């Protein structure tokens, strides 16, 4: 039985595959971090951002979305030189805007995980696909997620962004069915 296609690609994916390929329930806090790195995969590769995730968290190690809304262009100007993360003040400015949207949901008292888990009916989704090509990049819950986050002023939420986010968050199980031991049979 084979595990995952991008897993045999290199040890870095093996760590991410074993760290949490959507197996644990997600918290509203991690939901914000995931949509942040997940948004960068637009046109870019997930591994390209993965390396930047290590450097990016180093500078953004504040894990405090409120301060992120306080991070202005002056901060992105110096950060492009901090560790040499993905130099791109433009896309980084979008990240700061994402924080203001985070406060918008809080002003509404609605946690990110609350409405997301609600889209999947607070229940896990079993994918009957067999290969990555058989994996859907646009599901009703993923499509509903992008339009919803887009309304909150959340940028970088393409249809693949919503689907890729649920894939690793834990809302759905769909590596490719048969990934070494895909659950959902008798468990
Ligand atoms: C291969 N892969 C794994 N995890 C994610 N979150 C991804 N987003 C795009 N591609 C991804
Ligand atoms: Zn897998």
CB 146 within 8 A of CB 16: no
CB 47 within 8 A of CB 12: yes
CB 1 within 8 A of CB 180: yes
The reply to whether 182 belongs to the active site is no
Report CA(74)–ligand 1 centroid distance (Å): 30
Can you list the domains of the chain with their CATH numbers? 1-187 (1.10.340.30)
Beta-bridge mates of residue 126: 173
The reply to whether 117 belongs to the active site is no
**For ion ligand 2, residues whose CB falls within 5 Å:** 4, 175, 179
Torsion of CA 128, 134, 140, 146, to 10 degrees: 130
Report CA(163)–ligand 2 centroid distance (Å): 16
One-letter-per-residue 3-state SS of 117-153: HHHCCCCCEECCCCCHHHCCCCCHHHHHHHHHHHHCC
Burial classification of residue 26, based on how many CB atoms lie within 10 Å of its CB (0-12 exposed, 13-18 middle, 19 or more buried): buried
Q: How far from the centroid of its chain's Cα atoms is residue 136's Cα?
A: 16
Atom 11 of ligand 1, residue of closest alpha carbon: 46
Beta-bridge mates of residue 173: 126
């Amino acid at each position: 039985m084979e595990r995952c296609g991008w897993v045999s690609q290199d040890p870095l994916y093996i760590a991410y595959h074993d760290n949490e390929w959507g197996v644990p329930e997600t918290d509203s806090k991690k939901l914000f971090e995931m949509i942040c790195l997940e948004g960068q995969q637009a046109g870019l590769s997930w591994i390209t951002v993965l390396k930047k995730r290590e450097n990016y968290r180093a500078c953004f190690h504040q894990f405090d979305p409120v301060k992120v809304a306080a991070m202005q262009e002056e901060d992105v100007e110096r950060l492009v030189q901090d560790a040499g993360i993905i130099r791109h003040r433009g896309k980084i400015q979008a990240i700061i805007g994402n924080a203001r949207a985070y406060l918008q949901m809080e002003q509404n008292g609605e946690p990110f995980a609350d409405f997301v888990w609600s889209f999947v009916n607070h229940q896990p989704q079993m994918t009957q696909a067999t290969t990555l090509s058989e994996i859907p990049t646009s599901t009703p819950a993923s499509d509903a997620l992008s339009k919803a986050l887009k309304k909150r002023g959340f940028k970088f939420v393409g249809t693949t962004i919503c689907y890729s986010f649920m894939q690793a968050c834990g809302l759905v199980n769909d590596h490719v069915v048969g990934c070494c031991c895909y659950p959902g049979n008798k468990p």
